[PDB]
Structure formats: C-alpha cells, structure tokens
Design a protein around this ligand. Structure first.
Ligand SMILES: *[C@@H]1O[C@H](CO)[C@@H](O[C@@H]2O[C@H](CO)[C@@H](O[C@@H]3O[C@H](CO[C@H]4O[C@H](CO[C@H]5O[C@H](CO)[C@@H](O)[C@H](O)[C@@H]5O)[C@@H](O)[C@H](O)[C@@H]4O)[C@@H](O)[C@H](O[C@H]4O[C@H](CO)[C@@H](O)[C@H](O)[C@@H]4O[C@H]4O[C@H](CO)[C@@H](O)[C@H](O)[C@@H]4O[C@H]4O[C@H](CO)[C@@H](O)[C@H](O)[C@@H]4O)[C@@H]3O)[C@H](O)[C@H]2NC(C)=O)[C@H](O)[C@H]1NC(C)=O
Lengths: 146, 365, 58, 70
C-alpha cells in the first residue's frame, strides 16, 4: 500500500429551521450553540486535488451528564459531499431521551491514511421530546397503641 | 473450587509450543492438562453421566467438527453441570463457535471480521490497522476478576463481540476504546457495523445461576508468548514505550478467576432463635425478639477463612420485604437481633450476596 | 393432539366439548409434565427454574 | 461384602441340612459349621454353600431418561 493524506474544506454547517448557515475551519471549534442540523464537510485528498472516501467516517455524540455516547454514519450521494440531517422527531429509539448539551466529534480514519482527525466541530443542543447494590433499608411501622 | 483435571482442545498441535508461557503457568498451579485436536473423532467429555473433565479450554478457531460426543448442546450441559469453559477465537471463528457464543448471550461476528481502530494501534502492526492496543482505562475494575495490581497497555488482534442487553448476568471486562468499529477490513462500509461504539466488548464473561464461570475472549493470539514479551508503543506520535506488555498478569488473573481460585464463597450452617434461648421454636409469635446467624467462607488459597462482609443485608420477606437490615460481623458469625413485625403469616429469612466478581450466594429459611 | 378417543372421529378430539383442538402441537417453555393419571383426568406440571445461562426462555 | 449379607446356608451331597454358628477369631465375621459325620484323614466331603447379598448392584448412570435402560 501507499500512504495518503486527509483534508476537509467548505464545512459551513447550518441549523435547520422548520435556515441560517455558519462556517468553520479544521483547527478549531465553532463559536455559538446550534439546536436541532446537517453539518457538511467535503473530504478531499491533500497535496493533489482529488475525492477520496475514508473507510471510517462516523460522527460521534458524547453526553457529559450521563456519559453515554451515540455514533452515526454519513453516507455520500453522487454530489461529492456528505450529509447528516437530524430529524429531531425521528430516531426516537436511538436517543432514548434528550440531554441539553451534546459534544459532537468527527471520527475519521483509514488504513492508507497517515493521520486520523477527530475534533469537536461545535457544541450541539437537542431537545426533541443497581442489580447488585445495597437496597434501601426498610423498617416496620408498628401500629400505635390505643 | 472445582477439580484440577482439565481438557484442552487445539486448532493444531503447534499451539502447544507457541503458547508455552500460559500453559506452563497453568500446569505450575497444579492443573492437569490433556491436549487433543479439535477434529479428533475419539474425544468425549462425558461418559455415563460423569463429566470426566472438570474444566474445558477451547483454543481452536476454525472448527466445525468437534468430535464424538462434543457438540454445542454437550458444552451447554457441561456449563449447566458446573463446568468452566474458556474460548478464544481470532478472525477464523467458525459456525459452531459462533453458535456456542449465541448460546450464552455474547454474539460473535462474521468469519472475516476484525476489531479495527486507527487511533490506538501500535507500530508493530504492519497491516490494516488491526493490532489493537486496549488501554487499561476502560476495564471492568474488579480486583477479583482482573487482579489487584496496576497494569500496562494490553494489545490483542481478533474479532469483536457484543453483549445481549437482555442478559442480567453477562459482564464486560475489557471493552475497546471509542475509536473501534469492528467491520470488514479492506471493504467499504454500507450497513451499520456491529458495535461501532464503546460496546465492542472484546473480552466477555458469564456468571451462571449455578456459579459457572465462562470467559469468551476474542484473540486467541492474546494468550501467545509473542504478545507476552513485546513492548508496546502506540502509533500516535511519541507515545510512551513500555518495557513489559502487561498482558501476562491480566491473563493469569483471568485464569485464576475462571477456574475458581480468586473469588469463591460458601454458606455454612444458619441458626435462628428467640433471644434468650438456644433452639428454634416452631411458630414464632408476633413482636418477638429473634436472632439470626450465618457463616461464610472465602477460599483464600484453600484456607476457607471467614469472609470480610462489609455490607450483607438480611431481608425478612413475606411477598415483599417487611424488614431489611445489615448483618454486623461478630465472632465469625453474622448475627442480627430484631423484632418481628405486627403482620402474621409465613415469612422468609433471606440473604442475597451479589457482588461483582464474587460467587452469588442465596439462602432462604 | 394425537390420542384417538372415539371410533368414527378424528384424532385430536375432545369428548366434553365435542370439538377438534385448535393447536394440535405446541411446546411448554416454562413447564415440565410431572405426572398424568391413567385416563388423563388430572395433570400435574412442575414449574421450571430460571434459564441457567440467563437466557430469555419466554 | 461382610455387611451386605442376608443369608448363608450350608448343605451336604444329596438331601441334607447342617448348622453354622457365628464365631470370632483374633476380622470378617468367620462362621463355623458342624459336620454330621466327622471326616478321618484321607476322606472327602462335598459341602454346598449358598449365600445371598442384598443391595450390591449399583446403577452406574444413576439417572435414566423415561426411554433408556438400566
Ligand atoms: C389478600 O391477598 C392480597 C394479595 O395476595 C394481599 O395484598 C397485598 O398486601 C400487601 C400489603 O398491604 C401489598 O403490598 C403493598 O403495596 C402498597 C401499595 O403498592 C405499591 O405498588 C408499587 C410497587 O410496585 C413495585 O415497585 C418496585 C419496583 O421495582 C418493586 O420492587 C415492588 O416489589 C413492586 O412490585 C408502587 O409504585 C405504588 O406506588 C404502590 O405504593 C405499598 O405501599 C406497600 O409498600 C410498603 O410496604 C413494603 C412491605 O410491605 C415495603 O417494602 C415498602 O418499602 C413500603 O413500606 C412502607 O410501608 C411500611 C408499612 O406500611 C413501612 O414499614 C415502611 O417503612 C414504608 O413506610 C413508608 O410509607 C408509609 C406509607 O405507606 C409511611 O407512613 C412511612 O413513614 C414510610 O414513608 C406494599 O408494597 C400488596 O400490594 C397487596 N397485593 C395486591 C395484589 O394488592 C392482602 O393483604 C390479602 N388480604 C389480607 C386480609 O391479608
């Protein structure tokens, strides 16, 4: 095999209105808060303009309050770009409940590629809607004497 | 504990010489070892209802013909008869191995699969980013199962497995980092992969209701003397290079936990009586002082010393617990003195000790 | 379902209801047949345990 | 099999009966029999000894399905 690189352009994710758009670069996060959402990102090859498809292009959500995480996959059409549209009413089963603040990572990797990039594009806010432990100590409430 | 005699099934006899360290330690503890090929038409682990092998070890990926009496139902009946079964598959699983896994609630994957990760892999991979370096951060963290010392980054190559969330008993030991997805290598991804998140367990364990320890590990090679002696350095630029892998200590801990050596408990004679008496009188009366006593032994090197018992809870239950108290450790016996409630009927003293990595003990009088 | 109980009548026949069983064959997931009398008048079933390997056993 | 014993009878060639009494020697609860005619040196006597042992055949599988054999 021969080594290859990875580059992200355009970006400019936008909050969906039942539609403003904002853009950011690769090094840093996005200022502000976006509540749903479809982040767009054009993955091109570095050093020579070309269109590649990394083997792994999952998009990750981490919840700080509970510690749970949820991962999705962005599948391309024939537009040379991806799309991750959040229905905010669909995928009720995947998100059992909504948390205020979600941290959005972009995990991307390949065997041929030389460096996998994973940084939080922006913070996301989503408002769509024991077995072996000491059990609670129970006492008995005696009847009051007459 | 159990008996020392065990049976070892092999993919090929070469495993005797390449897994030398693990087998030598196992024999050093006294366990008698018999090696047989997984395709032998002569082996049998039961004869006239005897279970003539106490422990079973399966180091044979890529098998579909177990032998004379060994089937998936025979291994299931062996696990129902108190056996301790350790399996290890690596990218060559095979249909009966996957079926056996499905019989314990731990689903394997397709034959060609492998747990892949591109953030934490070591420089000794030389391939399609498949030699995973699982950190000791994401780990079950129970000193009975995994040991009581600090470890180093452990590394393995194999297939990923997921747990069925319907099982209350299944436990996950060494789940992979949030960068592993466990899909086909060298093939594009279309579906949703199998356990893409941090729920790619990679080393599972099952504790049956009759206290039968079963450890389904991926990565047969994880027990190979090549991984026991190789330094680890993640390919992320400039990661720390440890001298000792820290795989050997983990392996010995797992072996001592599945062959009933590190965590085992036993319930001795119980005794309950009126306060101020010596024998249990039939048909206690309402609001009568009652004393309860029970002994538990732990098998530390076979000594069966008294258990520590920080939090053991007695339940006085009719259909739902009327009383629930702690058992104060006093003179080797766990004795509590309490007054029976106003409600009459038949009742049940109940002790339940479900602790992670400890034998589940249950007693109701 | 497969016990003849009459002369000119199909096998799965019930005398008291004079009918034909709807489900001829089924399996008891949570019960073992402990005993059954000579004329199938009293049937005793032993309730089963939880599944050892912790399976569903619906 | 000294404890799982039920009966020990001793007869003689033809139709006959004999008497045995329990004895102790200084141990397997040896018995002694009193012959009808004492035998001189060089004689020969045929004595039939019949013993019955109870609870000595143990079932080896110890658990048999409704469609198996002992
Ligand atoms: C004829 O036959 C009938 C059936 O065979 C008999 O009936 C049974 O009778 C018993 C006793 O009366 C009933 O039990 C009680 O139900 C009460 C109402 O039910 C709740 O149901 C929900 C619970 O559901 C599940 O919840 C968890 C989920 O994991 C599960 O673990 C649990 O097992 C259950 O399956 C609940 O969500 C609802 O909100 C209802 O509350 C219930 O209040 C009773 O609970 C008591 O008692 C039990 C033990 O009896 C304790 O373990 C509880 O902690 C709770 O204890 C409180 O009361 C005790 C005495 O009353 C005190 O000692 C405790 O300290 C505690 O006190 C708190 O609350 C008091 C007020 O209630 C306060 O005064 C205190 O200060 C404390 O704050 C109990 O569960 C059965 O439901 C009932 N069966 C049926 C089918 O109805 C009937 O008796 C027979 N006839 C005769 C004449 O005998």
């Amino acid at each position: 095999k021969i080594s290859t690189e990875v580059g992200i352009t355009n970006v400019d994710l936008s909050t969906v209105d039942k539609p403003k758009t904002t853009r950011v670069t690769y090094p840093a996060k996005a200022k502000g808060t976006f509540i749903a959402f479809a982040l767009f990102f054009q993955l091109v090859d570095v050093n020579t303009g070309a269109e590649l498809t990394p083997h792994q292009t999952f998009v990750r959500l981490h919840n700080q309050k509970t510690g749970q995480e949820v991962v999705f996959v962005a599948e391309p059409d024939n537009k040379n770009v991806y799309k991750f549209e959040l229905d905010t009413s669909e995928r009720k089963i995947e998100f059992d409940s909504a948390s205020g603040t979600y941290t959005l990572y972009l995990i991307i990797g390949d065997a041929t590629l030389k460096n996998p990039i994973l940084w939080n594009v922006a913070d996301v806010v989503i408002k769509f809607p024991n077995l072996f432990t000491p059990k609670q100590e129970i006492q008995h409430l005696f009847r009051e004497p007459e | 504990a159990s008996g020392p005699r065990t049976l070892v099934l092999l993919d090929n006899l070469n495993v005797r010489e390449t897994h030398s360290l693990f087998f030598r330690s196992l024999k050093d503890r006294g366990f008698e070892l018999t090696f047989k090929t997984a395709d032998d038409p002569s082996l049998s682990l039961i004869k006239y209802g005897e279970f003539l092998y106490d422990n079973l070890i399966i180091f044979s990926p890529s098998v579909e013909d177990f032998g004379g009496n060994i089937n998936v139902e025979t291994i299931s009946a062996f696990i129902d008869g108190g056996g301790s079964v350790l399996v290890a598959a690596s990218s060559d699983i095979g249909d009966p191995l996957r079926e056996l896994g499905s019989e314990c609630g731990i689903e394997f994957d397709e034959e060609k699969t492998a747990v892949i990760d591109h953030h934490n892999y070591d420089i000794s991979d030389l391939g399609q980013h498949t030699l995973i370096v699982a950190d000791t951060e994401n780990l079950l963290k129970a000193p009975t199962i995994v040991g009581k010392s600090s470890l180093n980054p452990i590394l393995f190559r194999g297939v990923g497995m997921v747990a069925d969330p319907d099982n209350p008993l299944v436990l996950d030991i060494l789940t992979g980092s949030s960068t592993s997805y466990s899909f086909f290598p060298d093939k594009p991804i279309t579906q949703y992969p199998h356990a893409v998140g941090k729920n790619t367990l990679l080393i599972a364990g099952l504790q049956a209701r009759n206290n039968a320890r079963v450890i389904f590990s991926g990565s047969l090679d994880f027990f190979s003397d090549s991984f026991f002696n190789s330094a680890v350095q993640k390919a992320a630029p400039g990661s720390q290079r440890y001298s000792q892998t820290g795989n050997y200590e983990l392996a010995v801990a797992l072996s001592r936990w599945v062959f009933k050596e590190e965590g085992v408990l036993r319930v001795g004679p119980v005794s309950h009586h009126r306060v101020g008496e010596t024998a249990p009188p039939n048909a206690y009366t309402v609001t009568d002082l009652v004393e309860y006593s029970i002994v538990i032994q732990q098998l530390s090197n076979g000594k069966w010393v008294p258990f520590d018992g920080d939090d053991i809870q007695l339940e006085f239950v009719r259909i739902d617990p009327f009383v629930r108290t702690f058992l104060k450790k006093k003179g080797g016996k766990y004795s509590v003195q309490f007054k029976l409630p106003d409600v009459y009927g038949v009742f049940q003293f109940k002790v339940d000790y479900n602790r992670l990595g400890y034998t589940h003990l249950y007693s109701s009088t | 379902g497969q016990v003849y109980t009459e002369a000119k009548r199909p096998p799965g026949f019930d005398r008291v209801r004079n009918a034909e069983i709807g489900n001829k064959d089924f399996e008891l997931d949570v019960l073992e047949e402990a005993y059954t009398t000579e004329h199938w008048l009293v049937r005793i079933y032993k309730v089963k345990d939880l599944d050892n390997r912790g399976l569903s056993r619906t | 099999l000294e404890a799982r014993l039920a009966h020990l009878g001793v007869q003689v060639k033809g139709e006959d009966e004999e008497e045995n009494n329990l004895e102790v020697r200084e141990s397997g609860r040896f018995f002694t029999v009193k012959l009808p005619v004492a035998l001189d040196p060089g004689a020969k006597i045929s004595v039939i000894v019949e013993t019955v042992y109870t609870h000595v055949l143990h079932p080896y599988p110890t658990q048999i399905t409704q469609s198996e054999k002992q």
